[PDB]
Design a protein around this nucleic acid. Structure first.
Lengths: 121, 86, 130
RNA sequence: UAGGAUAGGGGCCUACCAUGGUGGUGACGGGUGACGGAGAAUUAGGGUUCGAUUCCGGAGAGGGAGCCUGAGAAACGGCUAC
RNA sequence: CGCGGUAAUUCCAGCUCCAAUAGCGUAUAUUUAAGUUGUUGCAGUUAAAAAGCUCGUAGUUGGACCUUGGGCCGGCCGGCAUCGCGCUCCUAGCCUUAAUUGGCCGGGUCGUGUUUCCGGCAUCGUUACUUUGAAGAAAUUAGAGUGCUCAAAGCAAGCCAUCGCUCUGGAUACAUUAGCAUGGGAUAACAUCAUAGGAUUCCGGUCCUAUUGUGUUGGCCUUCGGGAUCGGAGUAAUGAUUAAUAGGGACAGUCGGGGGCAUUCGUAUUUCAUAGUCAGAGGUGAAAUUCUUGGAUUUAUGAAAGACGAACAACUGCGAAAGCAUUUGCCAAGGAUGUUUUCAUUAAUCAAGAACGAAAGUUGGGGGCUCGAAGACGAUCAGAUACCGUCCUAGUCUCAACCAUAAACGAUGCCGACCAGGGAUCGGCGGAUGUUGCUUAUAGGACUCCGCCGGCACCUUAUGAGAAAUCAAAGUCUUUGGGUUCCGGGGGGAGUAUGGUCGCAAGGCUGAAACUUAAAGGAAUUGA
């Protein structure tokens, strides 16, 4: 039911490359747009959008994983006593490799880059 | 009675669609909605997502609109709203 | 996993309950079991609800029982896919003793035990209808 | 890569050349009345166990190496040596 | 397993009987029984048996859209019509204009050579599975046929005019991994059009190839067909399927006794100084060692020291687990929840391998208040080395290091779906012109609610499992086969010996066998 309603009564063209193709090259923040703006326009983002070409997005999960990791590592230079925190670090880095296993098969450059990328941004 | 499933399966009560998760539903939809929220300061009324997330302000008037909360938005002070969207 | 076994298991426990169905999510090898039930008249009707827009596919069953005797006395799985245990048209292990049938995915498609046997084509058992 | 050899390709060996090959899908190593097979026993079946045996293919013929003759034997009821 | 301690159906003889019978005992190996090897076809709450925990690989396993579905006739099968691609040629299905040619003829009538015309389908991205067929030793084995006289078996044999020969055989199956070839196109993968290097009727120029034509042979190509190459212009739903009661990530307000660091507080206990004052105190069931003008015990006030967070604190929380309660700040973190945000199968679970891992012991510092193995003391005690009393070292505490084990427990793998009623409470969310609130008013929040995701669990029945006790999982395994992994496979020996491995050490981890022996063990029930 749901999907047909969105497609018909939204907009699709014009309103969406203007609102959303700016904010994403400003810096990411796809979820920000849906939680503001003029509703009907973003109604059909899920029901008609692959994603325009962009820097980030495919890179966001990988980038985020490194970004959180470095701060945990910083707090593992101060006190060894954080026995809880070391196993969050252990868990999250082993999840981090999963992200760049799946998002390495569809596109080039990723295969070489993402192994090195761990811990250096 | 003996019911697993209903006597009229096709139309269940809304409370029994509040049972099952959004994904699980017989007819799935957003239970979430769009609404137009009404502000004296602006001539027009602005369409808003039910779960605000960001502290949405009205476009022309710097009145505010609602403040966010864990579920559907917690509206602040005297404001009014109708539930509609196209 | 593959659903299949879950449907069969759910069916027999639901018969003991005396419910008029249980309704659940369905897949494509579990589309097959329902159509075979219709042919051998464990079902005189089946309906595949919401297979159009939704995240999944599903089907509420309308099922024989709530009558006198249960039609499906037992159905119980006999291995899903991803395994090698195999029968031929001559190999035939069976349950029941000809009152039931042995569910078989054959070369052409899913058909009952006698149809496959006559054509002289083997396959892999999906479950045991008693 | 090349050559000599032999019926012939062949690391087959040998020169020069490169630095490889192969492994958890268990390689490499050890053990085994461990010959292999067709087959046998016994199991409803599925299997398990066995295969010295008038057959089939190979190995050896006291232990080892080496060789003559000849279509063909690295023979052993041939030789030659220890 | 048991019998024989003097009327032994268990011995030793006799009798009689049983029972296989030209055969029967006995031993060892082996198959069955034994589902004790669990593919078929296992068990792990408590009997033998889930690894402390998580990450996580090799390895296994893994969702859906997916030229598929439907309709007609003919007799499930054959052949058709939609949404059953295509070309060279081969092979090739019938007929029309019947024409060169032949016979007719007010007919272009008909057939053949020949133009048009179609069945029937070789090659044009990989497989696994399955099909049919070949290739497939005899014997053996199953087995056709047959009086080897029967028969085991063997491949012979049966009929005659039995003195003038007649004929049938010597089948077939088995031939097991794999390999070949053919058919199928379901199910599973490799795989696959988005930076398009895609298809193509358009056409060029460049450039190769040489048979026809050319008598023949030799040097050099025009036209041309087909390749190769580089560009220009055209056509089309032109070129990415959803968004798993699969997974991640973004974002929002939260939640928690999660972590760390800084920080702050409380009294207690101990000690000290100052204070006061006069007999007990430690201790217990009863005493004593031990301490008491070296006026204790007690009392108060400060300070120091070190520890800890009562009652509150719960069939309640969080964290991977081990574990975690004063305040406050900062720093990053994690789950649940919400989400028409995003990616699109990334997933599930695991030998190996990696991280963390109570206590004790320890390596060195800080630190030693409290308590407190050993020891030393008093009773009790034949012994008492203990419980019990008293002294008290290591240690307890903290920090950087070791370590790797626990009844590290839910004695219950992880993950997924399903099968059953009900009320609490923890968390979030939604709906109430409810209450309290009074927040200007409200929204919130605490309270009452109903609905609800995900919880810790209880309750009562348990359809059902189980040996029972019990259990909404120990169900959905005899209805025997959901995915994955680990472990057990009689008791002891023995979790040791030995070797390898590791540890600072203790010792751990890995882990037998000789030999013994018929029960070890569980739950319930009845006695004492």
């Amino acid at each position: 039911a749901d999907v047909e309603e969105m497609i018909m009564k939204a907009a699709k063209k014009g309103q969406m490359p203007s609102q959303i193709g700016v904010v994403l090259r400003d810096q990411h923040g796809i979820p920000l747009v849906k939680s503001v703006t003029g509703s009907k326009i973003l109604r059909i983002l899920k029901a008609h959008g692959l994603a325009p070409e962009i820097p980030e997005d495919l890179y966001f999960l990988i980038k985020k994983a490194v970004a959180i990791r470095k701060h945990l590592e910083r707090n593992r230079k101060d006190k060894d006593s954080k026995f809880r925190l070391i196993l969050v670090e252990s868990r999250i880095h082993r999840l981090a490799r999963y992200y760049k296993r799946t998002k390495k098969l569809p596109p080039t450059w990723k295969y070489e880059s993402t192994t090195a990328s761990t811990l250096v941004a | 009675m003996v019911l697993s499933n209903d006597i009229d399966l096709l139309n269940p009560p809304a409370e029994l669609e509040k049972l099952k998760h959004k994904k699980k539903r017989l007819v799935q939809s957003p239970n979430s909605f769009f609404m137009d929220v009404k502000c004296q300061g602006c001539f027009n009324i602005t369409t808003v997502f039910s779960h605000s997330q960001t502290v949405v302000v009205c476009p022309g008037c710097q009145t505010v609109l609602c403040q966010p909360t864990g579920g559907k938005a917690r509206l602040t002070e005297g404001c009014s709203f109708r539930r509609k969207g196209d | 996993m593959v659903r299949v076994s879950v449907l069969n298991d759910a069916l027999k426990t639901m018969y003991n309950a005396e419910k008029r169905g249980k309704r659940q999510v369905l897949i494509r090898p579990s589309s097959k079991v329902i159509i075979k039930f219709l042919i051998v008249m464990q079902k005189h009707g089946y309906i595949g609800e919401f297979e159009f827009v939704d995240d999944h596919r599903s089907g509420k069953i309308v099922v024989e029982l709530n009558g006198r005797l249960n039609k499906c006395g037992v159905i119980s799985p006999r291995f899903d896919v991803g395994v090698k245990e195999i029968e031929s048209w001559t190999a035939r292990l069976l349950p029941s003793r000809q009152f039931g049938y042995i569910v078989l995915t054959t070369s052409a498609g899913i058909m009952d035990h006698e149809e496959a046997r006559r054509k002289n084509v083997g396959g892999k058992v999906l479950g045991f209808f008693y």
